[PDB]
């Protein structure tokens, strides 16, 4: 004579009564949907969830070690880092290069950006946080990469009109679901910012953004790295010294530099040469700006 | 119910009127016939 | 005291009786209860659902 | 090409098995099998009726397990039940007692052996507890559309078959779908055993226990019912004081639907318990 | 007889009224209802399936919904003062489908028509302009969106019925008078007027029928109703300045028997201003009220005496 | 007790006739998800049933019974 | 009755054929598929259903969000169905309209948008081997100018694989939600038409709009239909609310639509010679130099209102000596406010 029950809600907006029954439950007993149900017995039988070169070390390790290196975790009693911050001045192309490397992880990738979480109505931010934790936390381990976290991490003094503090209600609600929820061994939160103007000071935690790797201005070395990635497969003639064209790429993000590569892919048809030349990169630079 | 308030320095013109409103509501719901033996809160700041 | 009025979630209202097993403790109004499709019997009820500064 | 006047004999066995099967008649589709013996052409008698385990598919030809049916029927043949199957029954809750296409398809497939193929559908869910009148179903030949539908003699029992006179199912789906009459039978063993068993079911164990309970409760609990009864009596007499005015003015027509007489007669009937049990207390005190 | 009176079982007691959505070439159509129930069954007799124009209300049943049937549901040279404008609308909307020797050689075919308006309005002068089409054409005039707003919010489907009967009546001119869509629920008027604009522009049609839009003010049309609403020609109606009133009153006096003793100016400009509507009313009740005196002559006191009813009617309440 | 089957009829609806058809098949405006066009019973005439009025219509037979309103 | 006679006599087999094809469960559409046996379905009554696939329908013929027939008794899928609104029949682009012969004025941007719709589809091999991807497209906003003439040019100069264009009035319509299944069904028509080029004309025509433009970006910029067919928005107002922050990416080449010049109108007149036969004695440059600073739509209104006023004059041939009042009246009376 033990007490155990649950509240049911059908899709046709009809509420009934039934206790917690079924087979052996391990991940069940959570407030979810898409469960088993018969014609009129309304019993629970089956619960189902409803819904490249210069960096290869930090990305691949931080996602494989919390799943494959559990033996060293039990042998050493150490938790792995969770949040990585690919910050720094623009030009590196953290959006297209970080998303391309997330596609190179060979795991599941879920798109999540700034305007994705910010909705016209209120209360939907936590719905998309618990939804990103439905697919990520509930589904198979996926990869989620967000960008432009500094623009929404503004802490103003006059608390009378600021939407970025409601984005700090959803965002700091996620930090409540990371600092408050110790078992963060599942899908992590990968963030990145294009500027260090307004950085959130409350991101100092192992579960939060800990591995803050500083990527400086894309100098000849760094522009040769990200641009060697951008040109590691295409037909590159043995004349691209990358000096003048890598020097002229000032204040140009990876999307604008990819557009420079497209403009290089524009006039080479009528240039007569079937292979991309050296001066076509700087021609694209002086063509976009 | 054990609360841990934090980052109150940025929320602390009429910037003080809302602070007196919410705080006077805190007194209005903490000094009367309130269950003080069950509720608990910790406020934190930075400066 | 033996027979009262119930309000279903779907919107239509009904009236039920008292079962010989339960008592008048939970039978008082203001407490959400449960019913059965056959005879509208009652199996059981349904329950609804000081300061420190460290700076 | 010949037809007679058939009538399905229904005893208390199949009736009570359809009452317990109706109590266990969950909204899920159920299966059942009837047995009996064929003595002649135009009569059929059912004796053995059992239930079948439910399934997610419901009423279908695939749910009928031939090894389970033949196994249980063999276990009935080794015992004192030398009767062959005569039909199959089920329940149709909610959507009415009519038969869908699947039911007439499995009926067409199950009627290849028995020409009668008696079909009975019980539905005690929406049926009131006042009447338990049940109806039996039959299957008509598709080639009889040219000739008469039912050339059945003895048209007298059709008046007894007209009791289920719903204006949607009988002639709402009467095409290729008719019914048959139902009668009962009771021997002396069921009459005396069941009659004395029901009278005893409404009587006491020794039949002398709960008499003195009321005979002595007439002075403790019934007094409250007598005082309240007099409160209702006065509650009517307060208007009966106003009745001789209207009765002394109009004297034409009756406007109040209340009779004010049979209720007081019933109050006298409840009051006669003291008089009837006074002699009982006289017998208990005497000897 | 038996084969015709044997399908009564389908159209008998279990019968309903639904709304069909479309008909598929696979001989099974799709219907709908308040909750949108889609049932596809092979078609039967009594239906046309050609002129039905799927998307209207049809007949359903409580059965498997086999479709048993369907259930359907003053000339141009009389008035003066605007002879150039009435030969402009005459020459403009009498150009298609009439006088074809100067219509097919040009090869323009602007299937839009003119858009009329008038500060007096009332449909008398505008109907006197649109009367040029009544010479040789089928009578078809959808006067305003009154039937659109007085009926349930069915939307532009009635405009689709008037457009399909205007397609089956191609030798006609769809005239619209007293456009009170936005000048007088309320949110549906914008979508049925935007669908009236889209279907009126010729979204799935060509130069079949002309559309003449007349109203009380040209400014009542929204700026969206300009570029896809007026591409053919626009007009301009000046003030009557007692000349349109003089010609209309001359037509009213061309049939009745009355001398020049009746003052014209104070009666055509009695209250504020009026061309033909209430002076036509006092001409009707002047012929009837003058007929009450058993005299065909118009008395100088009976005409103004009957005029006191109209002068007092719109001024008291 | 003969009426007990009409109690088992699960009640009846309240029909409102809005337009009569000349084919002896008068449509009746009923509760939403209704609008059930049907011929009236044989013992009641059709011409007497005037439109724009409420009537009594059964839920299964769809038969009309009668018209409803200092000196 | 005559049509119902042969079918009424042919209605006998409808009783023996009434038992099959009875399956009708309001044609509920599926949502996704996590596993092959069990499929999640959602009916229009906001009731999500789940059932296993039948043996009569192959699993490879199931598409995400496809309206198919389904039983109401066995709950299985008996037979699918291919499905038509007016947008489907009008959406097809035929009758080759104004061609390239109107080359004049804005020649650089029309080349930048010509070498993105013509060259990539005609010459795909050297655009893939030459770099990373062929150009995506450009943006055409700002002044109308010679509107409805350059999209016509793209229709006429097609490689005979005609592309699909969509007007902006179809997006903001009554009963919102149809825009998602509309863009998905025209993307499905693009899949049927061997990756047909998708165009959205006049995008200038609030959650009901945010779903159409945010989901529209999630479809065009998304890689589900295709990421290399066509992206171009020729309109009067760009309505840069989401593009205002989504422009640094797949979309680029922010340019204007066109601009009017003095010597450009003679080409649009040279293609208006393809209309009703005008006397060739009248020079097109004489008709073009007397209307300074006139856009393509203004001279389109010259050749439209001059054609209505030409057919109004009740003549045989069109000569400027007859409707010259219509010409100077249509350039000046419309040049006052435009
Ligand atoms: Zn059933």
CB contact under 8 A, C9 and A5: no
Q: How far is CA E20 from CA A222, E55, G226, in A?
A: 66, 5, 36
Residue F47's contacts (CB-CB under 8 Å, 6 or more residues apart) are none
- Positive/negative CA dihedral, E48, E53, E59, E62: positive
Residue written as tokens 């009967």?
E165
CB contact under 8 A, D102 and G73: yes
- With contact defined as 3+ CB pairs under 8 Å, the chains touching G are A, D, E
Residue written as tokens 């998303």?
A99
Tell me the C-alpha distance between G184 and G215, whole Å.
10
Q: Which of E9, E13, E14 is the closest to D175 by Cβ?
A: E9
Question: Which of the residues B7, B17, B46 would you substitute to probe the A interface, choosing the one with the greatest number of A C-beta atoms within 10 Å?
Answer: B7
Distance of CA D182 to the CA centre of its chain: 12
Distance of CA D73 to the CA centre of its chain: 28
Comparing CA positions, the residue from A178, A240, A253 lying closest to residue A210 is A178
Comparing CA positions, the residue from G98, G104, G92 lying closest to residue G149 is G98
CB contact under 8 A, D100 and G73: yes
CB contact under 8 A, F60 and D166: yes
Would you list which residues of chain C are within 8 Å, Cβ to Cβ, of chain A?
9-10, 34-35, 43-44, 46
Tell me the C-alpha distance between E201 and E223, whole Å.
15
CB contact under 8 A, A157 and B10: yes
Q: How far is CA D59 from CA A28, D18, D116, D177, in A?
A: 33, 17, 20, 19
Is residue G306 within a helix (H) or strand (E), and if so which, with residue range? helix G296-312
Q: How far is CA E254 from CA D201, E78, E246, E251, in A?
A: 106, 11, 12, 5
Q: How many CB atoms lie within 10 A of CB E116?
A: 25
Instruction: Kindly tell me whether chain B and chain D come into contact, counting contact as 3+ Cβ pairs under 8 Å.
Output: no
Comparing CA positions, the residue from E115, E90, E76 lying closest to residue E211 is E115
Residues E115 and E93 sit within 8 Å (Cβ to Cβ): no
Residues paired with residue C8 on neighbouring β-strands, in sequence order: none
Full strand arrangement of the beta sheet holding D90-91:
D90-91, D119-122, D136-137, D179-180
What proportions of chain A, in percent to the nearest 5, are helix, strand and coil? 35, 10, 55
- Token pair recorded at residue F9: 């009829």
Tell me the C-alpha distance between E310 and E272, whole Å.
13
- Positive/negative CA dihedral, G124, G129, G133, G139: negative
Q: How far is CA D219 from CA D223, D231, D283, in A?
A: 6, 18, 17
Q: Is E53 on the interface with G (CB under 8 A)?
A: no
- Counting Cβ atoms within 10 Å, is residue E163 exposed (0-12), middle (13-18) or buried (19+)? buried
CA dihedral D201, D206, D208, D209 (to 10 degrees): -80
Tell me the C-alpha distance between A68 and G128, whole Å.
39
Residue written as tokens 């420190």?
C52
Residues G142 and G239 sit within 8 Å (Cβ to Cβ): no
Distance of CA D262 to the CA centre of its chain: 31
Q: Is E70 on the interface with G (CB under 8 A)?
A: no
Residue written as tokens 């409601």?
A166
Give the three-class secondary structure for F2.
coil
Least Cα separation, residue G231 to chain D (angstroms): 52
Tell me the C-alpha distance between G166 and G169, whole Å.
9
Comparing CA positions, the residue from E191, E243, E199 lying closest to residue E222 is E191
Backbone φ and ψ for E16, nearest 5 degrees, come out as: -140, 175
What proportions of chain C, in percent to the nearest 5, are helix, strand and coil? 0, 20, 80
Residues of G in contact with A112 (CB under 8 A): none
CB contact under 8 A, G252 and A269: no
- Token pair recorded at residue D236: 């009517």
Tell me the C-alpha distance between G122 and G138, whole Å.
18
DSSP classification of residue C8: -
Residue written as tokens 């004579």?
A1
Residues D9 and D44 sit within 8 Å (Cβ to Cβ): yes
CB contact under 8 A, E14 and D172: yes
Residue written as tokens 């009542």?
E220
Tell me the C-alpha distance between B16 and B22, whole Å.
10
Tell me the C-alpha distance between G100 and G107, whole Å.
11
Between β-strands B2-5 and B40-43, what pairing exists: parallel, antiparallel or unpaired?
parallel
D90 in a labelled binding site: yes
Tell me the C-alpha distance between G69 and G76, whole Å.
9
Least Cα separation, residue F23 to chain E (angstroms): 11
Residues of E in contact with D168 (CB under 8 A): 13
Residue A168's contacts (CB-CB under 8 Å, 6 or more residues apart) are A152, A153, A154, A155, A200
Give the three-class secondary structure for E182.
coil
Chain A 28-57, residues with CB within 8 Å of chain D CB atoms: 38-41
Count how many Cα atoms sit within 13 Å of the Cα of residue A257 in the half-sphere of its side chain: 27
Tell me the C-alpha distance between D120 and D137, whole Å.
6
DSSP classification of residue E202: T
Residue A113's contacts (CB-CB under 8 Å, 6 or more residues apart) are A146, A147, A148
Farthest CA pair distance, chain A: 87
Comparing CA positions, the residue from G173, G170, G163 lying closest to residue G199 is G163
Tell me the C-alpha distance between D84 and D113, whole Å.
11
Q: How far is CA G187 from CA G178, G182, G183, G194, G199, in A?
A: 14, 8, 6, 11, 11
Residue E88's contacts (CB-CB under 8 Å, 6 or more residues apart) are E233, E235
Residues A226 and A198 sit within 8 Å (Cβ to Cβ): no
- Token pair recorded at residue E51: 């002129």
CB contact under 8 A, C9 and A15: yes
DSSP classification of residue D220: T
Comparing CA positions, the residue from E185, G218, E61 lying closest to residue A113 is G218
Residues A139 and A54 sit within 8 Å (Cβ to Cβ): no
Distance D58 CA to ligand 1 centre (A): 9
Query: H helices of chain A, where?
Result: 57-68, 70-76, 94-104, 114-117, 124-133, 167-179, 220-230, 243-248, 254-267, 279-288
Q: Is A267 on the interface with G (CB under 8 A)?
A: no
Q: Is E13 on the interface with D (CB under 8 A)?
A: yes
Comparing CA positions, the residue from A84, A49, A87, A52 lying closest to residue A196 is A87
- Token pair recorded at residue G262: 């003095």
- Token pair recorded at residue C9: 């979630």
Backbone φ and ψ for E174, nearest 5 degrees, come out as: -70, 115
- With contact defined as 3+ CB pairs under 8 Å, the chains touching F are D, E
Residues A154 and A164 sit within 8 Å (Cβ to Cβ): yes
Residues of E in contact with G318 (CB under 8 A): 106
What is the per-residue DSSP string for D5-68?
--EEEE-HHHHHHHHHHHHT--SS---EEEEEE--SSSEEEEEEEEE----SS-SSTTTS-HHH
Question: What are the DSSP E strand ranges found in chain E?
Answer: 16-23, 29-32, 57-60, 114-115, 173-176, 210-213, 233-234
For the stretch A241-250, contacts whose Cβ atoms lie closer than 8 Å and that sit 24 or more positions apart, written own/partner, are A241/A278, A244/A282, A245/A278, A245/A281, A245/A282, A245/A285, A246/A220, A247/A220, A248/A282, A248/A285, A248/A286, A249/A91, A249/A218, A249/A223, A249/A285, A250/A91
- Counting Cβ atoms within 10 Å, is residue B17 exposed (0-12), middle (13-18) or buried (19+)? exposed
Residues D44 and D36 sit within 8 Å (Cβ to Cβ): yes
What is the per-residue DSSP string for G312-326?
HTT-SSB-TTTSHHH
Tell me the C-alpha distance between F15 and E42, whole Å.
31
Question: What technique determined this structure?
Answer: cryo-EM
Tell me the C-alpha distance between E34 and F32, whole Å.
7
Residue E96's contacts (CB-CB under 8 Å, 6 or more residues apart) are E103, E109, E111, E207, E210
Backbone φ and ψ for C6, nearest 5 degrees, come out as: -115, 155
Distance of CA G317 to the CA centre of its chain: 36
A141 in a labelled binding site: no
CB contact under 8 A, F27 and E11: no
Residue D116's contacts (CB-CB under 8 Å, 6 or more residues apart) are D6, D38, D44, D86, D87
Query: H helices of F1-71, where?
Result: 4-8
Q: How far is CA E187 from CA E155, E181, E194, in A?
A: 11, 11, 11
Tell me the C-alpha distance between E16 and E58, whole Å.
9
Comparing CA positions, the residue from A230, A254, A232, A60 lying closest to residue A147 is A254
Q: How far is CA G217 from CA A254, F11, G249, G251, in A?
A: 20, 55, 12, 11
Polymer length in residues for chain G: 338
Residues E53 and E73 sit within 8 Å (Cβ to Cβ): no
CB contact under 8 A, C50 and B30: yes
What is the per-residue DSSP string for A180-198?
S-----SS--BB--S--SS
- Token pair recorded at residue F42: 């044989």
Between β-strands E233-234 and D32-37, what pairing exists: parallel, antiparallel or unpaired?
unpaired
CB contact under 8 A, A15 and C46: no
Residues of F in contact with E59 (CB under 8 A): 37
What proportions of chain E, in percent to the nearest 5, are helix, strand and coil? 35, 10, 55
Question: Exposure string (b/e) for A75-108, b if CB count within 10 Å is 16 or more?
Answer: eeeeebbbbbbbbbebbbbbbbbbbebbeeeebe
Tell me the C-alpha distance between C10 and E43, whole Å.
39
Residue D170's contacts (CB-CB under 8 Å, 6 or more residues apart) are D164, D179
Q: Which of D126, D127, D167 is the closest to F60 by Cβ?
A: D167
Residue written as tokens 């969106």?
E145
Give the three-class secondary structure for A84.
strand
Tell me the C-alpha distance between G159 and G122, whole Å.
8
Q: Which residue of E has its CA nearest to D173?
A: E9
Tell me the C-alpha distance between A141 and A62, whole Å.
13
Residue written as tokens 């009447």?
D131
Q: Is D102 on the interface with G (CB under 8 A)?
A: yes
Would you list which residues of chain D are within 8 Å, Cβ to Cβ, of chain E?
168, 172, 175
Residues E28 and E42 sit within 8 Å (Cβ to Cβ): yes
Tell me the C-alpha distance between B12 and B27, whole Å.
17
Comparing CA positions, the residue from G71, G49, G53, G73 lying closest to residue G62 is G53
Between β-strands F53-58 and F12-13, what pairing exists: parallel, antiparallel or unpaired?
antiparallel
Distance D127 CA to ligand 1 centre (A): 17
Residues of D in contact with F65 (CB under 8 A): none
Tell me the C-alpha distance between B7 and A277, whole Å.
55
- Counting Cβ atoms within 10 Å, is residue G263 exposed (0-12), middle (13-18) or buried (19+)? exposed
- Counting Cβ atoms within 10 Å, is residue G25 exposed (0-12), middle (13-18) or buried (19+)? buried
What is the per-residue DSSP string for E61-109?
-SSS-----------TTT--S-HHHHHHHHHHHSSSSSSGGGTTTT---
- Token pair recorded at residue G256: 């204007």
Residues paired with residue G67 on neighbouring β-strands, in sequence order: G29
Question: What are the DSSP E strand ranges found in E177-291?
Answer: 210-213, 233-234
Q: How many CB atoms lie within 10 A of CB G242?
A: 14
């Amino acid at each position: 004579r033990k007490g155990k029950c649950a509240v049911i809600k059908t899709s046709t907006r009809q509420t009934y009564f039934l206790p917690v029954i079924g087979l052996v439950d391990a991940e069940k007993l959570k407030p979810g949907d898409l469960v088993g149900v018969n014609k009129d017995s309304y019993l629970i039988l089956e619960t189902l969830p409803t819904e490249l070169d210069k960096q290869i070390q930090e990305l691949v390790e931080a996602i494989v070690l919390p799943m494959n290196h559990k033996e060293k975790f039990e042998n050493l009693g150490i938790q792995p880092p969770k949040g990585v911050l690919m910050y720094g001045p623009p030009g590196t192309g953290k959006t297209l290069l970080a998303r391309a490397c997330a596609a190179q992880t060979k795991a599941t990738f879920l798109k999540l950006a700034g305007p994705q979480l910010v909705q016209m109505f209120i209360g939907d931010g936590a719905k998309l946080v618990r939804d990103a934790f439905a697919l990520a936390k509930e589904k198979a381990p996926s990869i989620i990469f967000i960008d432009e976290l500094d623009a929404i991490g503004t802490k103003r003094f006059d608390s009378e009109k600021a939407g970025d503090r409601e984005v700090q209600r959803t965002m700091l609600e996620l930090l409540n679901q990371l600092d408050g929820f110790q078992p963060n061994t599942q899908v992590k939160v990968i963030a990145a910012t294009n500027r260090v103007d307004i950085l959130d000071p409350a991101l100092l935690r192992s579960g939060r953004l800990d591995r803050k790797i500083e990527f400086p201005m894309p100098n000849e070395e760094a522009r040769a790295r990200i641009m060697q990635i951008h040109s590691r497969k295409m037909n590159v003639s043995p004349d691209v010294n990358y000096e003048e064209l890598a020097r002229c790429t000032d204040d140009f993000n990876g999307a604008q530099c990819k557009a420079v590569c497209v403009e290089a892919g524009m006039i080479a048809l009528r240039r007569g040469a079937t292979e991309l030349t050296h001066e076509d990169y700087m021609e694209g630079i002086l063509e976009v700006q | 119910c054990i609360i841990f308030m934090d980052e109150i320095d940025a929320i602390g013109t009429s910037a003080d009127r809302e602070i007196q409103r919410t705080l006077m509501e805190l007194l209005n719901q903490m000094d009367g016939f309130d269950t003080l033996h069950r509720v608990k809160m910790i406020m934190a700041t930075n400066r | 005291e033996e027979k009262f009025i119930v309000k279903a979630t779907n919107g239509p209202r009904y009236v039920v009786g008292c079962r010989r097993q339960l008592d008048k403790s939970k039978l008082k109004p203001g407490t959400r209860v449960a019913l059965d499709m056959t005879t509208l019997t009652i199996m059981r009820y349904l329950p609804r659902e000081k300061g420190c500064l460290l700076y | 090409a010949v037809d007679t006047a058939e009538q399905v004999y229904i005893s208390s066995l199949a009736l009570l098995k359809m009452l317990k099967h109706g109590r266990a008649g969950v909204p899920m589709e159920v299966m059942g099998l009837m047995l009996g013996e064929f003595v002649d052409d135009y009569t059929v008698r059912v004796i053995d009726v059992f239930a079948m385990p439910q399934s997610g598919t419901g009423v279908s030809v695939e749910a009928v397990d031939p090894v389970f049916q033949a196994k249980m029927l063999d276990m009935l043949k080794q015992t004192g039940r030398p009767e062959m199957v005569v039909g199959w029954y089920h329940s149709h809750p909610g959507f009415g007692c009519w038969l869908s296409g699947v039911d007439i398809n499995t009926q067409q497939s199950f009627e290849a052996l028995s020409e009668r193929a008696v079909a009975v559908v019980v539905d005690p869910i929406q049926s009131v507890k006042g009447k338990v009148v049940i109806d039996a179903f039959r299957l008509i030949n598709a080639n009889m559309m040219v000739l008469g539908h039912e050339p059945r003699q003895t048209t007298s029992n059709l008046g007894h078959l007209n009791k289920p006179s719903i204006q949607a199912l009988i002639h709402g789906l009467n095409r290729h779908y008719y019914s048959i009459t139902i009668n009962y039978r009771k021997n002396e063993l069921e009459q005396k055993m069941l009659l004395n068993l029901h009278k005893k079911s409404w009587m006491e164990g020794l039949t002398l226990q709960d008499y003195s309970e009321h005979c002595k409760h007439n002075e403790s609990v019934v007094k409250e019912m007598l005082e309240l009864a007099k409160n209702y009596n006065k509650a009517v007499e307060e208007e009966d004081k106003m009745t001789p005015e209207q009765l002394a003015i109009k004297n034409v027509g009756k406007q109040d639907p209340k009779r004010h007489l049979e209720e007081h007669v019933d109050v006298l009937m409840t009051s006669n318990i003291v008089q009837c049990l006074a002699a009982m207390l006289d017998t208990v005190v005497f000897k | 007889e038996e084969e015709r009176s044997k399908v009564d079982d389908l159209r008998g007691t279990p019968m309903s009224v639904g709304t069909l959505e479309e008909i598929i070439d696979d001989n099974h159509a799709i219907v709908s209802t308040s909750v949108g129930s889609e049932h596809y069954v092979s078609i039967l007799s009594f239906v046309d399936k050609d002129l039905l124009e799927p998307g209207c209300s049809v007949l359903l049943n409580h059965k498997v919904h086999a479709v048993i049937g369907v259930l359907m549901d003053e000339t141009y040279a009389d008035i003066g003062g605007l002879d150039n404008q009435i030969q402009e609308i005459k020459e403009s909307v009498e150009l298609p489908l009439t006088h074809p020797e100067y219509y097919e050689e040009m090869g323009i075919k602007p299937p839009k028509g003119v858009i009329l308006y008038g500060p007096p309005g009332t449909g008398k002068t505008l109907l006197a302009k649109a009367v040029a089409n009544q010479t040789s054409a089928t009578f078809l005039r959808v006067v305003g969106s009154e039937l659109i707003q007085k009926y349930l919010g069915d939307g532009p489907k009635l405009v689709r019925e008037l457009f399909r009967v205007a397609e089956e009546h191609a030798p006609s001119i769809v005239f619209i008078d007293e456009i009170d869509a936005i000048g007088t629920g309320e949110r549906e008027i914008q979508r049925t007027m935007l669908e009236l604009l889209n279907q009126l522009d010729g979204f799935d049609s060509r130069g079949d029928v002309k559309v003449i839009m007349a109203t009380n003010r040209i400014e009542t049309l929204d700026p969206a109703l300009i570029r896809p609403g007026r591409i053919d020609r626009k007009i301009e109606f000046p003030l009557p300045d007692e000349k349109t009133k003089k010609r209309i009153f001359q037509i009213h006096t061309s049939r009745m028997t009355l001398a020049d003793d009746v003052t014209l100016d104070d009666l055509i400009m009695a209250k504020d201003d009026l061309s033909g509507a209430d002076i036509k009313a006092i001409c009707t009740e002047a012929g009837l009220m003058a007929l009450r005196e058993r005299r065909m002559k118009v008395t100088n006191e009976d005409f103004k005496k009957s005029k006191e009813n109209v002068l007092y009617k719109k001024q008291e309440g | 007790r003969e009426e007990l089957q009409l109690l088992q009829e699960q009640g009846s609806y309240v029909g409102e006739v809005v337009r009569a058809m000349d084919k002896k098949k008068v449509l009746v405006k009923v509760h939403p998800e209704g609008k059930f066009v049907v011929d009236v019973d044989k013992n009641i005439d059709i011409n007497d049933v005037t439109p724009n009025c409420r009537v009594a219509l059964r839920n299964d037979s769809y038969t009309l019974h009668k018209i409803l309103p200092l000196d | 009755a005559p049509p119902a006679l042969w079918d009424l006599a042919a209605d006998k087999q409808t009783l023996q054929s009434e038992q099959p094809l009875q399956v009708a469960r309001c044609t509920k559409i599926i949502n996704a598929d996590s596993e092959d046996p069990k499929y999640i379905i959602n009916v229009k009554q906001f009731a999500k259903f789940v059932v296993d696939l039948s043996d009569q329908v192959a699993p490879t013929d199931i598409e995400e969000g496809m309206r198919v027939g389904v039983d109401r008794n066995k709950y299985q899928i008996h037979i699918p169905l291919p499905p038509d609104p007016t947008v489907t029949m009008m959406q097809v682009e035929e009758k080759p309209d104004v061609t390239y012969s109107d080359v004049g004025g804005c020649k650089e941007q029309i080349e930048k948008l010509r070498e993105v719709v013509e060259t990539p589809l005609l010459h795909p091999e050297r655009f893939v081997n030459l770099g990373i991807e062929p150009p995506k497209g450009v943006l055409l906003f700002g002044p109308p100018g010679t509107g409805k003439t350059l999209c016509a040019r793209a229709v006429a100069n097609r490689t005979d694989a005609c592309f699909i264009r969509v007007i902006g009035s179809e997006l903001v319509q009554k009963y919102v939600g149809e825009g998602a299944r509309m863009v998905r069904e025209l993307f499905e028509m693009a899949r049927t038409k061997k990756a047909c080029l998708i165009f959205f004309d006049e995008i200038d025509a609030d959650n009901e709009v945010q779903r159409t433009m945010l989901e529209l970006i999630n479809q065009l910029d998304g890689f589900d239909p295709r990421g290399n067919i066509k992206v171009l928005m020729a309109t009067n107002r760009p309505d840069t609310l989401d593009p205002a922050l989504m422009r640094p990416g797949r979309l680029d080449r922010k340019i204007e639509f066109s601009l009017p010049d003095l010597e450009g109108r003679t080409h649009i007149f040279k293609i208006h010679a393809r209309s009703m036969s005008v006397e060739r004695d009248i020079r097109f440059e004489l008709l073009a130099r007397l209307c300074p600073n006139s856009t393509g739509a203004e001279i389109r209104s010259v050749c439209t209102e001059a054609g209505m006023f030409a057919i109004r004059a009740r003549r045989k041939i069109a000569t400027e000596k007859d409707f010259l009042e219509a010409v100077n009246k249509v350039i000046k009376s419309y040049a006052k406010f435009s």
